[PDB]
RNA sequence: ACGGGGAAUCAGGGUUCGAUUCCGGAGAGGGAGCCUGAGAAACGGCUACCACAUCCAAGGAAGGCAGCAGGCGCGCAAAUUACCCACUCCCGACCCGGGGAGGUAGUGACGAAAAAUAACAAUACAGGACUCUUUCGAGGCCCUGUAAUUGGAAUGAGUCCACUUUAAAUCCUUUAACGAGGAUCCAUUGGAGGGCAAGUCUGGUGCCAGCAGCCGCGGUAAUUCCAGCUCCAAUAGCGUAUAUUAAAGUUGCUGCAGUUAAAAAGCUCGUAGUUGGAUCU
């Protein structure tokens, strides 16, 4: 049972603020340890440098060719594979080129297909994805 | 520093659940109904009901001989009262929570242009009130959801210096008189 | 809706009076004060150049 | 900061003086004087606000640079120069004469007075001390020291000061059964009989008061200004007596009042 | 793996070009449009098979 | 982590944010020391040192934008080297001078408020409803439109004289004159398997390209990809990413659990803590 005085505050203020942090939602956010892990340091968005197209298969029951990029960070020189999402896209797109990544949605889990892929392009070259897929605009060079 | 004031408040709440069938058919029928341009215009009205009901529902726990409730509560009533949602025998202050949505949109000025019966749709009632054809006792108004008060509806009337109540005719038919 | 229109206004006693109390801009509208023809970036560069200057080349600058 | 600031900001101003969120980033910030920066009406917001006699700060200058305005009847050509508690305002170009009472509900009023009575104000007494070859002294709320005063003129009374003099005519001292105003916190601008004065050695003393029709209030003993002796006031009053009406009368004036109309 | 096919579909697929029609309808009259089309002037007819762009 | 006043969310309890215009603190590249003065350990004052860095005739001289603008760099990430002391106020010997304080414009889909993108009438329908005919079918009685059918009446958005506004301008308000029939003066952003409103329609591809938050879809009839049509939702706004709050009675004081799902210490003694039987007018 719980304790129930009325002088048994601090027993129950201070169990509460031990058995807050077996809650891993909380700890993953008040622990700094996967703050440093994040690639970006929580920001929404981050731009990079593309190193190369490197395209990733997909996971059991269902097959197909993921095409994925292979970018740079600028802002702390770290690496990431981001995801290029519609059909066509990987041809806006050639090397060394300035990408803008987001995360793909899941706040740094890999979502479904995907094997270990945590972010997906939004820009390129400053210009969108978005304008370049539905051809409201062009690949500047 | 700044002589600006940043004091501003949003006037309506969307709803928890985006797409539920038989919200959406209701409100789609109170917008046929009532003229209303899109759904915003009924979680307006929604909105200003629950702040009603809420200040009602506070008021109602203090007991009847408190000053708070005696004060307040008497003047919530009477804008009740003024704004044309209540009559006056039922100024107790459970017959607040029997008002409904419909009874704050009759009170609209588009609605209250097409009783009257200077339009002949809801529809009419909108433009003919966004032309700057309707005015309230001296004043064109150019707003349809404007709460006509008790004492301000025997005046509303076809603004004098309009082609329907004035008489200089307008764009249209003076061109129409050039071309005869 | 265009039927009214407010404003203030005042009736002085004479044109003394009202070339005293009365601001400078309000009298400019009746031709009566004319304010002079300097842009304000010029007096603070005019300003700020004879603050180098010691006695009487001050009045030569500008 | 390093030394004394010069500017008061206009959401920080005192809120009796009534002054809008929207004209200005400052406020008049009052000069140093007799009053509390806290507890007075400068000159300029008596003017132009309540009196409407100016429309900007500009022409509070031009009228008090013409000499017009005597606070006290003595000239004052500045315009936050801070007025406060039972200060004679002498306009002689009109012929008015105002003083600064407090009205019912915390704030000041335009009070105007028949220059009959603007001779005299009265005054509080705040501290009495000998000094100087055994001279003894006064010091009022408005700094005012009236050295050689009556000896039974002790602290928290009230003397009547001569305006053109500046000496003492005659006083109240501080006892039940008299009649006071409430000159500071939530009970401000309340007239009404002193009943009862409760003793906190060390701390304050709680002064309780009765109304006119049976309110009963109390105060520290510092809001406490003595009015009269009795039951009769030794100056005017406002429109209204004193009294603060409760928010549901003060509406039901309102409603029967207005239909008084045609 | 292999890179080659990419927009494979995206390019294959006949160019179908949009067809002209009216422009639609805009903000209240659209409201009042879609008002009328399902209460006012509902058909007393085959019932249950309430499903607006029913294709048979 | 500058602190408060406060802000978001919220049944009740709560949780999280608060650099940011008000109050209080601190600091002017980093430490340190002073002069003057009522008040400063002051940086739009001085003297050093450490760090940068400007001119130089090489002997010397001068620096401090976390003021307003502006520039570079950084980055996902943020406006004009504009006008004026007319307002609000402040300083001075001062009714007169000054003020990038502050005000006014410019940029601005941060965000919040109002709110257009059409209304009406006459016809006709192999449309519906109301009175009669057993039924065919008889009507201005009420409604509707995949009528790009006809018809005038109404109007802003714009274009633009004038007034008004203001320091002077703008903007809005007020008015001339022009200003709507595919009223081309075209409304968009996401979606149509289920969660979750709305097509197992047609063409293409054939575990490919790709979609899909999750479940799942695609191997030659794909309700899911690429498109055409049609339909749906919000609507001058709508998607996405991340922080956070509710949902979460999945942190539980209210209010959870602990035989078998995660979990009662091997047992007992024990100080602090927590909790303690009747009884007095």
Redesign the pocket.
Known sequence: ????????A???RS??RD????????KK??LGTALKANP?????????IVLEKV?VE?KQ???????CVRVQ????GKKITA?????????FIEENDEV?V???????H?????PGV?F?V?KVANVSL?AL??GKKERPR | ????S?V?????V?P??????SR?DQ??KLIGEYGL?????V??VKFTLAKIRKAARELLTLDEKDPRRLFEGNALLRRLVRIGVLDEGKMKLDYILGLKIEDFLERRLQTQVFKLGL??????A????????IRVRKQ?V?????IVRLDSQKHIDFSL????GGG???????????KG | ???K?T?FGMIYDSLDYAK?NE????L??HGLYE?KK????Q??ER?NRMKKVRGTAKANVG | ????????????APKHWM?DKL?????????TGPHKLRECLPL??FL??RLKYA?????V??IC???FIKIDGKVR?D??YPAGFMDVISIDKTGENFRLIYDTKGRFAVHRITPEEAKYKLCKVRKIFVGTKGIPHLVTHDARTIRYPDPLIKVNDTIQIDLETGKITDFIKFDTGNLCMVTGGANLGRIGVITNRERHPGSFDVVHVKDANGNSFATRLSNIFVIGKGNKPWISLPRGKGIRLTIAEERDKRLAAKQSSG | ??????????????????????????????????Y???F??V???FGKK???????
Request: proline share 6%; charged share 35%; aromatic share 6%.
């Open positions: 049972g719980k304790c129930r005085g009325l002088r048994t601090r027993k129950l169990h509460r058995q807050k942090w077996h809650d891993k939602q909380y956010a008040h970006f340091g929580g920001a929404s968005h981050a731009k990079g395209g997909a029951p269902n097959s197909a060719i993921r095409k960070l600028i802002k702390n995801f290029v999402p519609n059909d066509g896209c990987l041809n803008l987001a995360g793909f949605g899941r706040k740094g890999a979502v479904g297909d995907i945590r997906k939004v978005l897929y539905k | 520093p700044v002589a600006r940043w501003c408040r949003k006037t309506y969307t928890r659940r985006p797409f539920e069938k959406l409100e789609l341009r899109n759904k915003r215009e979680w307006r339009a002949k749709s809801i529809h009419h909108r433009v003919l009130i966004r032309q700057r054809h064109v150019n707003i349809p959801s404007f210096r309009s082609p329907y200089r005719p307008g764009r249209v038919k003076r061109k129409n008189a050039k | 809706g265009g039927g229109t404003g005293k601001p400078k801009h309000r400019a509208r304010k300097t842009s304000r970036k007096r603070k300003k | 900061a390093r030394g004394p600031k010069k500017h008061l900001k206009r959401v920080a002054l004209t200005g980033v400052f406020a008049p910030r009052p000069s300029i917001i132009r606000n429309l900007t700060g500009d022409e200058k031009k640079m013409q000499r050509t315009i936050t | 793996g292999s890179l080659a096919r990419a927009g494979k579909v995206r390019g294959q697929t006949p160019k179908v070009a949009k067809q002209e029609k009216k422009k639609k309808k805009t903000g209240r009259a659209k409201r009042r449009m879609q009328n089309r399902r006012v002037n058909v007393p007819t309430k499903g607006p762009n029913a294709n048979s």
